[PDB]
Amino acid sequence: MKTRITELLKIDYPIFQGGMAWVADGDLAGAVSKAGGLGIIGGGNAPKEVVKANIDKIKSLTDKPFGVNIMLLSPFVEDIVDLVIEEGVKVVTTGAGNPSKYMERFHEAGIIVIPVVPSVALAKRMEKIGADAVIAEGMEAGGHIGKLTTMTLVRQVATAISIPVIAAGGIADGEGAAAGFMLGAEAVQVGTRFVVAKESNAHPNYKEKILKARDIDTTISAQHFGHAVRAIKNQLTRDFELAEKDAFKQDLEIFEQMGAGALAKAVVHGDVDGGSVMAGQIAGLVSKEETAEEILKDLYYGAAKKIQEEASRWTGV
Amino acid sequence: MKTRITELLKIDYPIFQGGMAWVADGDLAGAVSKAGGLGIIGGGNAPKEVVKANIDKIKSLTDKPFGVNIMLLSPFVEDIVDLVIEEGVKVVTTGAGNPSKYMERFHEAGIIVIPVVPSVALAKRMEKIGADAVIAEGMEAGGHIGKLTTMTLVRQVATAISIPVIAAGGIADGEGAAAGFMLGAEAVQVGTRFVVAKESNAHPNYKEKILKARDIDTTISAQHFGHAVRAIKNQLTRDFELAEKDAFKQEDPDLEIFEQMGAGALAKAVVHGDVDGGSVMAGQIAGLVSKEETAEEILKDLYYGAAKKIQEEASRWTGVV
Ligand SMILES: Cc1cc2nc3c(=O)[nH]c(=O)nc-3n(C[C@H](O)[C@H](O)[C@H](O)COP(=O)(O)O)c2cc1C
Ligand SMILES: Cc1cc2nc3c(=O)[nH]c(=O)nc-3n(C[C@H](O)[C@H](O)[C@H](O)COP(=O)(O)O)c2cc1C
Ligand SMILES: [Ca+2]
Ligand SMILES: [Ca+2]
Ligand SMILES: [Ca+2]
Ligand SMILES: [Ca+2]
Ligand SMILES: [Ca+2]
Ligand SMILES: [Ca+2]
Known part of the structure; x- marks a missing residue:
């Protein structure tokens, strides 16, 4: 072929x-x-x-x-x-x-x-x-x-x-x-x-997050700022979404300090709570x-x- | 087969x-x-x-x-x-x-x-x-x-x-x-x-909306309320979005604005061809439909x-x- x-x-x-x-x-x-x-x-x-x-x-x-x-x-x-x-x-x-x-x-x-x-x-x-x-x-x-x-x-x-x-x-x-x-x-x-x-x-913790993920376990963050990112749900995305819901009721420093080196934290050091576990919706199929x-x-x-x-x-x- | x-x-x-x-x-x-x-x-x-x-x-x-x-x-x-x-x-x-x-x-x-x-x-x-x-x-x-x-x-x-x-x-x-x-x-x-x-x-006006649509011409409405609806962008979707942004800035917003905008919106578009004030539901694939x-x-x-x-x-x- x-x-x-x-x-x-x-x-x-x-x-x-x-x-x-x-x-x-x-x-x-x-x-x-x-x-x-x-x-x-x-x-x-x-x-x-x-x-x-x-x-x-x-x-x-x-x-x-x-x-x-x-x-x-x-x-x-x-x-x-x-x-x-x-x-x-x-x-x-x-x-x-x-x-x-x-x-x-x-x-x-x-x-x-x-x-x-x-x-x-x-x-x-x-x-x-x-x-x-x-x-x-x-x-x-x-x-x-x-x-x-x-x-x-x-x-x-x-x-x-x-x-x-x-x-x-x-x-x-x-x-x-x-x-x-x-x-x-x-x-x-x-x-x-x-x-x-x-x-x-990718850290074993990062790989584990993907392996254990369900179809519905990804979310979109930062869509309202024009910088939509898809990642597996974790403490970071929750804290980010909580702060976005807050922001839509009304300061953008809280977001860039939340996001600063987030991907590196997860991939390199396996901080899958506070880091960004970027992955697609198909993560559910990856086992x-x-x-x-x-x-x-x-x-x-x-x-x-x-x-x-x-x-x-x-x-x- | x-x-x-x-x-x-x-x-x-x-x-x-x-x-x-x-x-x-x-x-x-x-x-x-x-x-x-x-x-x-x-x-x-x-x-x-x-x-x-x-x-x-x-x-x-x-x-x-x-x-x-x-x-x-x-x-x-x-x-x-x-x-x-x-x-x-x-x-x-x-x-x-x-x-x-x-x-x-x-x-x-x-x-x-x-x-x-x-x-x-x-x-x-x-x-x-x-x-x-x-x-x-x-x-x-x-x-x-x-x-x-x-x-x-x-x-x-x-x-x-x-x-x-x-x-x-x-x-x-x-x-x-x-x-x-x-x-x-x-x-x-x-x-x-x-x-x-x-x-x-579907009214000729509704069909024409789909036929002229481009790939990027749909949008999702009402996500902040948790009620996602995909439709071709028009005055209704612009209105709903602006109203949504305004409402969340208020302590006690009148939510009757949303039920007045959306009530019978699809029917207006489908039966009567109000493709500006009505809801032109359609998928992202509308751009391909020619x-x-x-x-x-x-x-x-x-x-x-x-x-x-x-x-x-x-x-x-x-x-x-
Ligand atoms: C952890 C991660 C990091 C990514 N970083 C980039 C990037 O830096 N630049 C880019 O063009 N795409 C980036 N992507 C997108 C990929 O290159 C690829 O197109 C995408 O993952 C394909 O979809 P899938 O995840 O469903 O397979 C990234 C994806 C993942 C999962
Ligand atoms: C104008 C319009 C009205 C629809 N109304 C309904 C509905 O009442 N109930 C339902 O289950 N799906 C509804 N749908 C979804 C379709 O039944 C169908 O699954 C969908 O259009 C398929 O995606 P496509 O638009 O990309 O072809 C509607 C879709 C359109 C375009
Ligand atoms: Ca190695
Ligand atoms: Ca990309
Ligand atoms: Ca099967
Ligand atoms: Ca007929
Ligand atoms: Ca549906
Ligand atoms: Ca080609």
Whole structure:
């Protein structure tokens, strides 16, 4: 099997392990890339020397292609742009910001550029400015979310643009992967499930929170401030929502002191009470710690089996 | 081809036209059932005589199975429950409320019961009290919504229960329908796209709102009150939002403003085409809906479009083991 994504990126599986701040370090990304998917380092708000450490690590683990996810509103964005070009990174994905500032520079260096998009208008603009592909990420995803769901966003984006679309948000098995393809995506991006990979350095407490999570255990915080974040319910989200209910009755320092280094606390130190346990709605389905390779194969061969089984049921229609 | 749903309901297509208040009358439901899908009358908050008129209409149009969607918190719920038994309706779907009260009564009558569920826990409980199937409706759906999306809800519900699951929310072409099947659904339920059916009596202004909508043109109203409703943005949604913000700043706000804005809002839009002051309920998939077609053409696009997509993807994936 081939897709425009497998062919453009020269990878065996049409599966990205999503760039994730703190979680997506060299070890995790390396494991995914070695296994045949696209590992992606989460640049987040890390300065150059930190991101370089992860790139050094991945290059020591595998020679296969990998991505770096750049957060464009990072105070260190200019350094991270330098770094990926300096290091010969094959693929860049970008969060919310303005990739147009960097597009020609990336392309003059030979980098493939794949912005994350929350809307049809944004996907069309990304295509217009020369993006090689886009990731359509549903609001069910972990982390900073838009408003459209994977079902409706992926379908509408795939219809609107000619460049390949990668479905992200809510995918944690072969069935979910296959659905993504049915909507018109040519690859899938998986986040939540990769956090519990054996090669993931997410604290055991963070992984445990995902493993034990029910379907209904995520919530959206900070929606009223225009910075909606999806995470597993805990003391932080409760205290945050309590303070939001308060604020809607009327001071924003209480929120940024509540949120300051929240993700790091959880991922690195396993403070899953006071930290931010970002994860998607599909956390409910994620129930086993497995190797990155095992996850990739389950996603890929699970998709294949489901598609073949369903094709059999639908033959002659 | 057949699924457990086509077998249970004795219909040709594993496709429901979802019950919709005001929009899903006998004409639309009749047209869908006649063409081989499951038409479903929207009971809404209507009294017995109004719902009966719709049942009488379908029966005059087709002998084929149809459903009635019952809103369990309606002041006339007991009468609508009477009505569906009295008229020998084959299927009942249930939106709002817990149908446990009525489950044995429906089954003694021989009715197939299919509750709409927003969670794994509720799906499992519907299963154990005897539901014949469940509809897993994603938050992208038009109307009163839960929090889980179609991608995540359908998948988790299908893995959790043995009874068949129907995917609803965000489906408006063969690709969306095929996706629902991949997630483990054995039928799909479609709302938004059936609103623009030629046989739909939604006012031309209402249809035009859906047809011109973009992907980002829906919004959720009344979340601060805990009463989430998805609709196309308009003066009503702007008014409700501004009023909501203002109310929460007051010690003792007059909540009559909200019941005056919302009362009969859907009916105003659907029957009379007040798409500025009325409620234009519609799903996020409204942006994809671009064509007025017959119920049959919509059914066939969904069904044969799904078959085509599955066959195309099978050709891409064949031999992968
Ligand atoms: C812990 C965590 C951190 C994330 N951080 C980022 C990020 O820094 N940049 C970004 O573009 N996406 C971020 N995401 C989104 C993922 O890259 C991915 O698209 C998403 O997790 C897919 O949805 P899923 O979680 O349902 O699989 C993050 C997700 C998680 C779970
Ligand atoms: C105008 C409109 C009215 C609706 N009214 C009801 C209702 O009364 N009861 C119910 O269970 N669902 C109601 N729904 C939801 C549908 O029955 C169906 O599940 C939903 O529209 C499917 O999602 P979709 O709009 O993305 O196709 C309504 C939907 C719309 C668009
Ligand atoms: Ca995001
Ligand atoms: Ca396309
Ligand atoms: Ca390790
Ligand atoms: Ca509903
Ligand atoms: Ca099942
Ligand atoms: Ca008519």
